[PDB]
Design a protein around this ligand. Sequence first.
Ligand SMILES: CCCN(CCC)C(=O)c1cc(C(=O)N[C@@H](Cc2ccccc2)[C@@H](O)CNC(C)(C)c2ccccn2)cc(N2C=CC=CC2)c1
Length: 329
Amino acid sequence: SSNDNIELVDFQNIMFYGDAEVGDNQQPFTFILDTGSANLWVPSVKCTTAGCLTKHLYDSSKSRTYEKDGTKVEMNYVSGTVSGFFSKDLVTVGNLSLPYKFIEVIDTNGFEPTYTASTFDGILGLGWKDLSIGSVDPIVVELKNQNKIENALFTFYLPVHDKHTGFLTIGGIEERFYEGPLTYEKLNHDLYWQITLDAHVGNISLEKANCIVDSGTSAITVPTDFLNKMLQNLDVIKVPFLPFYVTLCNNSKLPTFEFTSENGKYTLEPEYYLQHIEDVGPGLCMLNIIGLDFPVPTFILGDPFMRKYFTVFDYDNHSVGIALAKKNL
Ligand SMILES: CCCN(CCC)C(=O)c1cc(C(=O)N[C@@H](Cc2ccccc2)[C@@H](O)CNC(C)(C)c2ccccn2)cc(N2C=CC=CC2)c1
């Protein structure tokens, strides 16, 4: 009970959400807790789109601590786009709270149909300041600045479907979340939570690769040439003209990711990047791996990675701690 804990609810083993409150009356909202962006936004009661009809809305008039901003802002994600205006109000996360600058959202049409199809209301950013729109100091950083917490760090312990729940911890590291050694890796930039690791998949090896730890992505992305090289010759089959590959679950040819550094070694087994589809045959599965090319060769470590590894995000020390997550409690 020493640190701040936000319980994470698993969504069908593919996603996970975390709740937080806005306004001095604690208006509840379901958030995607995202280490891949650095902005917080909620749908407003002034929302004019159909999606907002199925979500929890933010009423500025009901909040004594609401401060009008009104600055128009248009958030562009990879998945879609939401638009609205800036507003300042009391943001409550767990047992902590602070006056914060967020985005009241009026238009969610650019975020459809993903928005309506999903159960979350908004997105909460957990990245660095330079990643944020409107130059907003990260919420944990500001929490340390206001001496609400001792250390400006937050840890992710992801849930497992029909097993145990998850936790986002602010203020410190809890021993119960991991077993084995906790190995830190320095950030190569104060932007994303990105670290440098050597990637190894069977014969394929890409050294000094840029790895981004992204909780807002439910897949592992890899350079396209890397993926192409690593898929042959596994008995995997490509969905017709869809960018997804499928195979039998008992496929022994399936390799293991090995991200190695001078500090530590982290691996990802087939059981972590395989999703289950049809129960026909002996288990049909989909590879949760996406080919993605950036100017700098980049691996994106999404939900699959973090579901294996308890992760620590340290603003003060500018680094990412990785430990094997404790199997049960
Ligand atoms: C509708 C969500 C889809 N979904 C679940 C499917 C049911 C995902 O797992 C998912 C979420 C996102 C996403 O927008 N992530 C952003 C945050 C976010 C999350 C959900 C919805 C909307 C926004 C950002 O945090 C992305 N993070 C960065 C910027 C690092 C990024 C950039 C490019 C590609 C992947 N990730 C991106 C992806 N992609 C994966 C491979 C190639 C392109 C995009 C997948």
